[PDB]
Amino acid sequence: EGRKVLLEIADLKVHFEIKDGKQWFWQPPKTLKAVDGVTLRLYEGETLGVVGESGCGKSTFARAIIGLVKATDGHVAWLGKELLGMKPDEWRAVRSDIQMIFQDPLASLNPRMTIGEIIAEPLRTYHPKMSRQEVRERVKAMMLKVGLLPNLINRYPHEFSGGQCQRIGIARALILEPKLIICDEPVSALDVSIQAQVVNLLQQLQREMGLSLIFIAHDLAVVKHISDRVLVMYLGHAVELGTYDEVYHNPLHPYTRALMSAVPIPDPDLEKNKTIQLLEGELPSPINPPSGCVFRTRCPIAGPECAKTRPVLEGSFRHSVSCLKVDP
Amino acid sequence: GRSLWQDARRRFMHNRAAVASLIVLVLIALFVILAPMLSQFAYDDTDWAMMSSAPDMESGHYFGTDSSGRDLLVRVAIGGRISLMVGVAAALVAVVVGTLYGSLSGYLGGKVDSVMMRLLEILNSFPFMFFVILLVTFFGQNILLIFVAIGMVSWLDMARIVRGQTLSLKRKEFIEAAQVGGVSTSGIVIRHIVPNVLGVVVVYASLLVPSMILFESFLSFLGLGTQEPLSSWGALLSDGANSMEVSPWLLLFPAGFLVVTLFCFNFIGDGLRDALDP
Amino acid sequence: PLAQQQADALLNVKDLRVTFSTPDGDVTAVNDLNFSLRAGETLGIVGESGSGKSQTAFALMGLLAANGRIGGSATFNGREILNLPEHELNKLRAEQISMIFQDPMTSLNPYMRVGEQLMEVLMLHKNMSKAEAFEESVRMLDAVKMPEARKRMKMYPHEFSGGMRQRVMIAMALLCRPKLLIADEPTTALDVTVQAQIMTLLNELKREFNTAIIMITHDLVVVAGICDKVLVMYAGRTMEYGNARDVFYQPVHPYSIGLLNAVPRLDAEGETMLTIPGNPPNLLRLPKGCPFQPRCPHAMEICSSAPPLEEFTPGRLRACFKPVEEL
Amino acid sequence: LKFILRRCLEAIPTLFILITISFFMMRLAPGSPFTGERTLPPEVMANIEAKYHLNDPIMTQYFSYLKQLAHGDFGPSFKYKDYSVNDLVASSFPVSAKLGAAAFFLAVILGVSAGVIAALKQNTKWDYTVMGLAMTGVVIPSFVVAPLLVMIFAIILHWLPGGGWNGGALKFMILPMVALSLAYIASIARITRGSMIEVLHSNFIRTARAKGLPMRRIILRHALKPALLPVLSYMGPAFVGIITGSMVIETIYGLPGIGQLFVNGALNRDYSLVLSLTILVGALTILFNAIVDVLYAVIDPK
Numbered sequence A: 001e002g003r004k005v006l007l008e009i010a011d012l013k014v015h016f017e018i019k020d021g022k023q024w025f026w027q028p029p030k031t032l033k034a035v036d037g038v039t040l041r042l043y044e045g046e047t048l049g050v051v052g053e054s055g056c057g058k059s060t061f062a063r064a065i066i067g068l069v070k071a072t073d074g075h076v077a078w079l080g081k082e083l084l085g086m087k088p089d090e091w092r093a094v095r096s097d098i099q100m101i102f103q104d105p106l107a108s109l110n111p112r113m114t115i116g117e118i119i120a121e122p123l124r125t126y127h128p129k130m131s132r133q134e135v136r137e138r139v140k141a142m143m144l145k146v147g148l149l150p151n152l153i154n155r156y157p158h159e160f161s162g163g164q165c166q167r168i169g170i171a172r173a174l175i176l177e178p179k180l181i182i183c184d185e186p187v188s189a190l191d192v193s194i195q196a197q198v199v200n201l202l203q204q205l206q207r208e209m210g211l212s213l214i215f216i217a218h219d220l221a222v223v224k225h226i227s228d229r230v231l232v233m234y235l236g237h238a239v240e241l242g243t244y245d246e247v248y249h250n251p252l253h254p255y256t257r258a259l260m261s262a263v264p265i266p267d268p269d270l271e272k273n274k275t276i277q278l279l280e281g282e283l284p285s286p287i288n289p290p291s292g293c294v295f296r297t298r299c300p301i302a303g304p305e306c307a308k309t310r311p312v313l314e315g316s317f318r319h320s321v322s323c324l325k326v327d328p
Numbered sequence B: 001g002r003s004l005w006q007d008a009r010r011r012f013m014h015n016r017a018a019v020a021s022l023i024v025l026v027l028i029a030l031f032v033i034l035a036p037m038l039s040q041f042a043y044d045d046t047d048w049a050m051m052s053s054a055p056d057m058e059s060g061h062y063f064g065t066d067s068s069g070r071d072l073l074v075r076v077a078i079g080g081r082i083s084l085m086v087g088v089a090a091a092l093v094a095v096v097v098g099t100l101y102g103s104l105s106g107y108l109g110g111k112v113d114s115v116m117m118r119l120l121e122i123l124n125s126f127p128f129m130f131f132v133i134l135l136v137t138f139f140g141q142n143i144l145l146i147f148v149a150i151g152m153v154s155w156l157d158m159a160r161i162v163r164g165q166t167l168s169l170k171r172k173e174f175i176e177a178a179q180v181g182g183v184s185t186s187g188i189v190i191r192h193i194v195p196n197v198l199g200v201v202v203v204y205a206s207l208l209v210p211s212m213i214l215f216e217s218f219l220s221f222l223g224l225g226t227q228e229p230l231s232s233w234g235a236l237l238s239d240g241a242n243s244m245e246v247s248p249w250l251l252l253f254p255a256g257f258l259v260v261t262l263f264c265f266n267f268i269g270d271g272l273r274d275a276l277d278p
Numbered sequence C: 001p002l003a004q005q006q007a008d009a010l011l012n013v014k015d016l017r018v019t020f021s022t023p024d025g026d027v028t029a030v031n032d033l034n035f036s037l038r039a040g041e042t043l044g045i046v047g048e049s050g051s052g053k054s055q056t057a058f059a060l061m062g063l064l065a066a067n068g069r070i071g072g073s074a075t076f077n078g079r080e081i082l083n084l085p086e087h088e089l090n091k092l093r094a095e096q097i098s099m100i101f102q103d104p105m106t107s108l109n110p111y112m113r114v115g116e117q118l119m120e121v122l123m124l125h126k127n128m129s130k131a132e133a134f135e136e137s138v139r140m141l142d143a144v145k146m147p148e149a150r151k152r153m154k155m156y157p158h159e160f161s162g163g164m165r166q167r168v169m170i171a172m173a174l175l176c177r178p179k180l181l182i183a184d185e186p187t188t189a190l191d192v193t194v195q196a197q198i199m200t201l202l203n204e205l206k207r208e209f210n211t212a213i214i215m216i217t218h219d220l221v222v223v224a225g226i227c228d229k230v231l232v233m234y235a236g237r238t239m240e241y242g243n244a245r246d247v248f249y250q251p252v253h254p255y256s257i258g259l260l261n262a263v264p265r266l267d268a269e270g271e272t273m274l275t276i277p278g279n280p281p282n283l284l285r286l287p288k289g290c291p292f293q294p295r296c297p298h299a300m301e302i303c304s305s306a307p308p309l310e311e312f313t314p315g316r317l318r319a320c321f322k323p324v325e326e327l
Numbered sequence D: 001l002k003f004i005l006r007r008c009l010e011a012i013p014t015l016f017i018l019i020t021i022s023f024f025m026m027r028l029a030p031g032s033p034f035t036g037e038r039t040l041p042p043e044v045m046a047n048i049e050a051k052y053h054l055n056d057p058i059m060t061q062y063f064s065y066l067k068q069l070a071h072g073d074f075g076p077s078f079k080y081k082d083y084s085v086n087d088l089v090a091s092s093f094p095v096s097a098k099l100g101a102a103a104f105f106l107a108v109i110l111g112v113s114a115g116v117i118a119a120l121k122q123n124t125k126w127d128y129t130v131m132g133l134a135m136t137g138v139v140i141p142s143f144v145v146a147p148l149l150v151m152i153f154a155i156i157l158h159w160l161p162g163g164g165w166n167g168g169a170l171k172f173m174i175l176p177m178v179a180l181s182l183a184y185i186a187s188i189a190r191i192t193r194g195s196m197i198e199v200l201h202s203n204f205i206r207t208a209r210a211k212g213l214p215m216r217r218i219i220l221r222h223a224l225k226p227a228l229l230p231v232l233s234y235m236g237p238a239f240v241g242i243i244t245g246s247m248v249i250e251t252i253y254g255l256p257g258i259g260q261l262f263v264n265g266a267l268n269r270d271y272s273l274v275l276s277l278t279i280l281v282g283a284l285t286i287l288f289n290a291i292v293d294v295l296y297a298v299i300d301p302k
Ligand code: SF4
Pocket: A254, A255, A293, A294, A295, A296, A299, A300, A301, A302, A303, A306, A311, A322, A323, A324, A325
């Protein structure tokens, strides 16, 4: 029943060692618990938005799926094959299907290479027997698809206006005909009108090629437009997971109520009249998360049971929460 | 298109100091090459009619004579061969050792980076001129020992800057994107990291050659250095410093070529710094 | 009407022009800018990169780069601010005018205890003793909702999160009780909850101290909270000016329409965002006449001339040639 | 606290590695008395064999050398007859110390002064003269500056003496001190300028200006500490550069300091005196760089 399950993630953890100069040389490293206890499944033809404050680990979660950072525990599976135990070579079979778009427009592109080479580098790496003519024609066709003029082929990435650089990044991801593309803050650096060009383009390409996306962003309002489901994160935990109607119109988790009421609205008669929720105290350091529930220091409805045990995602496909004191 | 090394070429040609320098440095190379071959006199020859004389255009001793009755024009050229060949050889050794240590320290990540950069800071606290003098006095002044000894003590800042550049590139996005594009570790090094590390290497190599010419010329001013049949500019300067009361040209000609040469490389290095890293 | 808003002003800026002497030729980053402001008002200067909005703030403060040149006028309580010598401009810079900046991480001095970074304002401008300056700094940190203010005074700013560093900046800027606060993108570096706190704080402190605010941002969503008058800018030129309500509900200039459609929303569902086409503007080789010409859906041959900054409905400015009823 | 301890636990084995390589480098060298050539004058060998057991196993001869250093004894010279190495250090160390300390203080004072006066007055004649002189001093070597100062002031003008110290009177110290320091006045000025310009354009100096502070208070309280930290980091190399440059300066002007003593040892193949002074100058540099990095960690609050 339903669409194909494309990617499954269960009990994923990413702990980084940290040994800062404030420790004695004798002492063990501390653990930066960047991600701890994410659990979800992503379907074919679906966009999952991942959203949260700085330090939520959404960028490390992205990097753990595609293999740029080694997961400490859990399982990730693509089309039924496990990813986290894989040898360095068999990752190439999976990366034919899984590709990525990155935070910084200029940094994403090698500054010593032309556009034609940057978009051709995946294609040349996966099809070594393909001719220089076929590679140039594939690249010109993909440039015309992302909205770059074909005669720009021989120009270098410093000649481009930042929004054009994320179009090169999209073209490089799509040249293989992938099935999941992961977007690590694809529109953070860009001007507001250009953000809407890149988001409309990703949403067109999803519909035109049949992709799934994992879309990671800081702006809740951008995430609502492109996503079908949203994962809300706090200090490496999954706090809420549901469809784009439920997570924004019926938020149950206290952090999502705070985050969605803190989102600013582009209407003077609404922004001055909304019921603002406010959180007591700073973001805890991810070098020493609180024991039990990690939101326990900021939560408006806290209680002593939340120090004794740690919540996990419970609920339906439509909506699920990690809280002891609310139930959908 | 705006090929970034052709913009660097345009910046280098616009910097008039740097082009001027390169002309000068090539004219010094042509003097150091040709003068012993075009000369009427040899490096080991003597004319006791002119035991020590100032420049005289009818004599053919155009730079005057050393107090053994011996020609300074030929000796300043032959000594320029030694100082430039030791300087370039020592720079090659320091560039290879420094690039290898810096690239491994930067690419292998935190574990190895931590200890390898600790060793540079510790080692930079040794008296390397005393340590090269200790090698040279205990093992006997061979020119091949001086190439290697000057190089093996002067790669530390070269390794520090190549480490900084390599660790920055290993953190950059287009290396993560090359891994996601299925590119092998050898492909990432050869086609993505090396072309971007190469800028720092060319700038610091060009700035390092004059320090090696100075280190040799110091080590040969005290004595030590290279012996009489293979005397460098620093060895001529000490015979000059003694002779200075009677025949001051024995400082001024060696000093002119050495100072000019060191000036030249400094402006070529700053021209490349400006060109490759605005 | 604007004839009245020119007369009762705290600040009245006429033909402000900012030009940078870059090697590619003179770049006019702000171009004949005109506006005025009164005690308790907020002006939201709004636009993307290349709009020049950040240079307007620095031109009023005299904080431009070395290669910058300022022309025009800025009348303030009957004095004139622009091109004053530093020894006289320093008499305005915290006692009457004040500023907060885009990056809270690098704006505080990392080599000094935060309490002295506050106290140096009061000891210079209000002639306080070091004893009075400490207690007034503590009262201002409490007004700014800083926790355990006395303990925080002895900290260096690397002990603090980016949200607390903007609180220190606001406490430091407002310490003298200014007439005007200028705010260059204060929340762009910060999370959504810290943004909602700092905008709620400024909206309360505006009412207690009776400051005017110039709020500079790309986020129309943040403008809608603090703002009373909006000033839309593109390529250094005024595109629209008027009441915040008016500009947000009846935007009369095509770029204002495109930007308020490109800004995403929670309140209603839809198929696509109605984005403005084309690349962001370059100030070198910017097109003559209207700067929005290579992007505009309503472009006409007359737009090769510069459009006049006319008024249509009393209290607004239009900067466009299309008839006002055809949008 | 923890930083002081970390520096000490790195400095101690650093000096022990330097002693260990330098001893085995003497003990395995050609012509070295330990190999048994015994070509030295009998009166010198009678002094060597009284402090070194020339027949003992290689390891035993290394531990007996560490024993001598632990009691502060460097052992006998392998060429001088009546002079101990400690005697030769004692007669030459104050001559190096007075010239080196004068050249170092002059390099810091004139260098930081010129560099601040080049970061202020950024694109005026005052920068173009200071960065002109800071090119000239780095590029013209100390062994070219020193003979030219003798030529101008002792041979041509007769204003100052070219010879060695009559007991350290200022007229004999002034040319050595200028010749030794110019290469470092220039280098300090360059580092100070570059640091001070990066500071004067910083967002914290922009915020100091935005408070309306007078430029006197912006320089002295806000800018000067962050500007001089890169100069303090440079005090390590500057120390090495001045003890290094002392070899050419003491040799040209004829000063009986540790640089002349080391060079005369190295020309004469006195392995003991050359080994000795390398361990001494190494220990002084390892200690001084620890003191500099500790002072940096006390001034910097990060
Ligand atoms: S589990 Fe407890 S502390 Fe955590 S969000 Fe729910 S109510 Fe708050």
